[PDB]
């Protein structure tokens, strides 16, 4: 009932860190994103992933990074992880030059397309907006199998990031992983990340329309076993 972790490598971890965008996109500089990346770099490295951080990629670069990565030989690896830090809209992330469908970035790893990652977990963590809604708060193996998307927010909603500390989702995810990454199952970790973000964060803003908002992450799992980074 657990994913076999007996491989010489845990797996590759691609971190796409998009901070500066083309003015044609009209997207602002994501302050605090470098802090997220560095933190995420330390966590996933600790977990034992071979992480490489790619900055200000463009949609093609991103698609290539993923197409190529899916093309490597993952036979000696337990899994694959990819973390996306950037701007976004519903179903789409922003390259420095525009927006590309997350579905395209992930499909490369389908069972029919990455045989060496077949029956192995493929993890994508996405920190990006998914719309413009604010939460006010209240006081034969299937080809689509073995994927897990840890989104920072829910469909149709904004995702918060503090210029000086990083995004809520990443601050949360990193504290949890640092302390429990090696002892709790992935769903437990993400559930705790879910609770941490919901209870410990609340937007501070000068625009009242954007003041005191809350946020809840969203985990989608097509996993078929329990995942322990150990």
């Amino acid at each position: 009932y657990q994913y076999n972790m007996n491989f010489e490598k845990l797996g590759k971890c691609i971190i796409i860190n998009n901070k500066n965008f083309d003015k044609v996109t009209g997207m602002g500089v994501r302050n605090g994103t470098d802090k997220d990346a560095e933190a995420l770099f330390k966590c996933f490295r600790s977990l034992g992933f071979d992480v490489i951080v790619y900055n200000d990629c463009s949609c093609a670069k991103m698609q290539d990074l993923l197409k190529k990565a899916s093309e490597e030989d993952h036979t000696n690896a337990a899994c694959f992880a990819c973390i996306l830090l950037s701007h976004g809209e519903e179903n789409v992330i922003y390259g420095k030059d525009g927006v590309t469908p997350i579905k395209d970035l992930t499909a490369h790893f389908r069972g029919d397309r990455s045989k060496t990652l077949l029956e192995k977990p493929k993890l994508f963590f996405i920190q990006a907006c998914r719309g413009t809604e604010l939460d006010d708060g209240i006081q034969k193996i299937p080809v689509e199998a073995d994927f897990l998307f840890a989104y920072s927010t829910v469909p149709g909603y904004y995702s918060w990031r503090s210029p000086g500390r990083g995004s809520w989702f990443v601050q949360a995810l990193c504290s949890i992983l640092e302390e429990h990454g090696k002892d709790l199952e992935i769903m437990q970790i993400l559930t705790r990340v879910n609770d941490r973000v919901a209870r410990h964060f609340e937007s501070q803003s000068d625009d009242p329309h954007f003041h005191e908002k809350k946020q809840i992450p969203c985990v989608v799992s097509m996993l078929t076993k329990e995942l322990y980074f150990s």
């Binding site: 602002g28 994501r30 302050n31 605090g32 950037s86 918060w160 990031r161 210029p163 501070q204």
Partner: peptide, 4 residues
């Protein structure tokens, strides 16, 4: 706070 900023949003993404």
């Amino acid at each position: 706070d900023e949003v993404x």
